[PDB]
């Protein structure tokens, strides 16, 4: 019940502890990519050009709120392909719309060609297929698991089962497989394609997202959130659960430091940058305001 329906009492302390953790384990700050107004407008118009078959209009402010994760969580010091950057901007945004849509509106025949059109505009032939398959797999997974028994089992059993589901469902495998062309770094490209890149970063992305999206998701009956494993109405059990998740994040980050310099740079900018964006998006500042729910 409502005594369990929000993580608001822990908002300030957990935000502080998240930042404390990154300052002591990552150290290097994330950094915005600033697109021009023309580049931002190109991205947005391509976004509108992808969801228009599905019928709905999406405001500039909604697009800008979706695209911030790409602006904050890539690795600017290592970028070599700004066309691949813009592709990740568009692909991220249009599949976030899909993630927010009611499944009865998931028209694959109309939407999948639009995803391919994006990948072919921005990527070479081989990259286009890799980016497109991951986009296809991501939107199919989100459709697949709406009120699936599989999701219920994997989210309610253990943190191990839940994070295993999230390697795909949170979109990080997709992210890696559309982002390696930005960097054109051979080791990073191989970790992206084995999905080791996604598995190394899944928990740090997921735990942060789950904390700040918890209120919205429970109000909408969405079960894919690790803090639904613990009783968030008891401070003691919550704090103990939360420390376990910080420990998870720390172990991952320290193992990431065994990767080569450029690769760990990208991995860590992703995790820390997602945190910075997540704490500045109004999507995650009520259960249900007008920038995150709508309609069903």
Window 46 to 75, contacts with Mg ion (CB under 5 A) = none
CA distance 120 to 87: 10
From CA 268, how far away is CA 29, in angstroms rounded?
9
CA distances, 67 to each of 95, 105, 142 (Å): 11, 22, 19
CA angle 165, 25, 80 (to 5 degrees): 75
213 annotated as a binding-site residue: yes
Residue 146 binding its own copies, by CB under 8 A: no
Nearer to its own copies, 22 or 259 (CB): 259
Question: Least CB distance from residue 126 to its own copies, whole Å?
Answer: 10
- Residue 157 interacts with its own copies (CB under 8 A): yes or no: yes
9 vs 186, beta carbon nearer its own copies: 186
**141, two tokens:** 């997974």
For the CB of residue 42, give the shortest distance to its own copies in the complex, in Å: 30
In the block, residue with structure tokens 């990259």: 127
Q: What six digits make up the tokens of 90?
A: 């568009």
The reply to whether 99 sits in an annotated binding site is: yes
Location of structure tokens 């709508």: 294
Q: Which does 99 bind (CB under 5 to 8 A by kind): its own copies, Cl ion, Mg ion, none?
A: Mg ion
| Residue 103 makes contact with its own copies by CB under 8 A | no
Which does residue 111 bind out of its own copies, Cl ion, Mg ion, none, counting CB within 5 to 8 angstroms by kind?
none
* 111 near its own copies, rule: CB under 8 A: no
| Whether 128 contacts 195, CB under 8 Å | no
Q: Is 235 marked within a binding site?
A: no
When asked if residue 224 is in the footprint of Cl ion (CB under 5 A), the reply is: yes
105 contact choice in Mg ion, its own copies, Cl ion, none (CB below 5 to 8 Å, kind-dependent): none
Site for its own copies in 186-205 (CB under 8 A): 187, 190, 193-196, 199-200
Closer residue to its own copies in complex, CB, 30/204:
204
Footprint (CB under 8 A) of its own copies, residues 7-46: none
Burial of 236 (0-12, 13-18, 19+ CB in 10 A): exposed
Specify the residue, 144 or 223, whose C-beta has the smaller distance to its own copies: 144
H-type alpha helices, 123-231: 125-144, 149-156, 159-169, 172-183, 186-194, 196-219
Please name the residue that has the structure tokens 């600017």.
76
Q: Is 160 exposed, middle or buried (0-12, 13-18, 19+ CB in 10 A)?
A: exposed
The verdict on whether residue 126 carries a ligand-binding annotation is no
What burial class does residue 209 get, using C-beta atoms within 10 Å of its C-beta: 0-12 exposed, 13-18 middle, 19+ buried?
Answer: buried
209 binds Mg ion (CB under 5 A): yes
Taken as a whole, the chain contains a residue count of 296
Tokens of 153: 């089992």
Q: How far is the CB of 36 from Cl ion (least distance, A)?
A: 36
Applying CB under 5 A, which residues contact Cl ion?
222, 224
Known binding site for Mg(2+): residues? 99, 209, 213, 217
Which stretches of the chain bind its own copies, using CB under 8 A? Answer: 129, 133, 137, 140-141, 144, 149-150, 152-154, 157-158, 160-161, 164-165, 167-168, 173, 187, 190, 193-196, 199-200, 248, 251-252, 254-255, 258-259
């Amino acid at each position: 019940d409502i005594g369990r329906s929000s993580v608001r009492p822990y908002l300030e302390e957990c935000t502080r502890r998240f930042q404390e953790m990154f300052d002591r384990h990552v150290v290097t700050r994330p950094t915005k990519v600033e697109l021009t107004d023309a580049e931002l407008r190109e991205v947005i118009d391509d976004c509108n050009a992808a969801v228009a078959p599905l019928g709905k209009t999406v405001s500039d402010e909604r697009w800008i709120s979706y695209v911030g994760v790409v602006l904050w969580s890539q690795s600017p010091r290592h970028i070599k392909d700004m066309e691949a950057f813009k592709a990740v901007c568009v692909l991220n945004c249009v599949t976030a719309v899909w993630d927010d849509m009611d499944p009865a509106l998931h028209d694959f025949g109309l939407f999948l060609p639009q995803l391919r059109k994006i990948c072919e505009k921005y990527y070479g032939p081989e990259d286009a297929e890799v980016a497109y398959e991951a986009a296809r797999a991501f939107v199919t997974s989100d459709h697949m698991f709406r009120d699936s028994p599989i999701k219920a089992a994997l989210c309610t059993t253990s943190p191990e089962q839940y994070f295993r589901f999230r390697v795909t469902d949170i979109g990080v495998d997709f992210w890696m497989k559309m982002s390696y062309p930005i960097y054109r770094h051979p080791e990073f490209t191989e970790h992206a394609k084995t999905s080791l890149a996604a598995r190394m970063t899944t928990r740090g992305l997921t735990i942060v997202n789950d904390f700040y999206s918890y209120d919205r998701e429970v109000s909408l009956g969405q079960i894919t959130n690790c803090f639904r494993l613990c009783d968030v109405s008891d401070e003691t059990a919550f704090k103990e659960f939360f420390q376990a998740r910080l420990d998870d994040m720390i172990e991952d980050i320290e193992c990431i430091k065994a990767f080569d310099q450029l690769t760990q740079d990208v991995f860590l900018d992703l995790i820390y940058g997602n945190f910075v964006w997540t704490t500045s998006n109004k999507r995650y500042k009520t259960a249900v305001n007008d920038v995150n729910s709508r309609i069903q």
